[PDB]
Amino acid sequence: GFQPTNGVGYQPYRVVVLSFELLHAPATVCGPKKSTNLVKNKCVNFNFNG
């Protein structure tokens, strides 16, 4: 019963629901990975693509 004269609660809301599933197939979506700058000619630990 929406009308323009409304208060805090009796307002129309949009809802979007996300859902996910697991399977033996390969993964298709993931969050991105952060990466440092590169220092050179120094003794350091390193991680390149794992």
């Binding site: 033996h24 197939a25 390969p26 298709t28």
Partner: protein, 44 residues
């Protein structure tokens, strides 16, 4: 679950035969289809 393809191209000038020689194939692509394949057919 990954389907992988390899390929190469070369010129030949010979008839009704595979010419004797040696080559190696670079990788091209793979696809995450994960669909078991049992049969295939070629189109012309």
């Amino acid at each position: 679950g990954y389907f992988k393809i390899y390929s190469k191209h070369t010129p030949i000038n010979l008839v009704r035969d595979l010419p004797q020689g040696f080559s190696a194939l670079e990788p091209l692509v793979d696809l995450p289809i994960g669909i078991n394949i049992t049969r295939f057919q070629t189109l012309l």
